[PDB]
């Protein structure tokens, strides 16, 4: 319950998609393979082309929005040391190198009691 979003939500459904939504991948900036994530820009331009922002900063903005929702996080390299997640802030850059990923902690339905996909 509680749901302090609104519009966020309806851009989290869209991140939650792989077609219209975003798309994650590995970069490797610096070390590691860093599964399932996007380029800091990637967001902001997505975003942006989401019509959920007019310029980069709105992006950005909304971008750090989803973080603090607990719907992304920050991930090596660029964005990142002092991260705070109390107040709104806006703690996001808008590159390539910083990268971003999904927050595991959020609604994440899990077979319970349900027709479940098979395993390789």
Do not use: C
């Amino acid at each position: 319950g509680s749901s302090g979003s609104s519009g966020l939500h309806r851009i989290v459904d869209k991140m939650h998609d792989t077609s219209t939504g975003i798309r994650p991948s590995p970069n490797m900036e610096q070390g590691s393979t860093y599964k399932k994530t996007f380029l800091g820009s990637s967001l902001v331009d997505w975003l942006i082309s989401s019509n959920f922002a007019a310029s980069r900063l709105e992006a950005v903005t909304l971008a750090s929005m989803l973080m603090e929702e607990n719907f992304l996080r920050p991930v090596g390299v660029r964005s990142m040391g002092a991260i705070r997640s109390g107040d709104l802030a806006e703690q996001f850059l808008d590159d390539s190198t910083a990268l971003y990923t999904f927050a595991e902690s959020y609604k994440k339905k899990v077979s319970s009691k349900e027709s479940g996909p098979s395993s390789g």
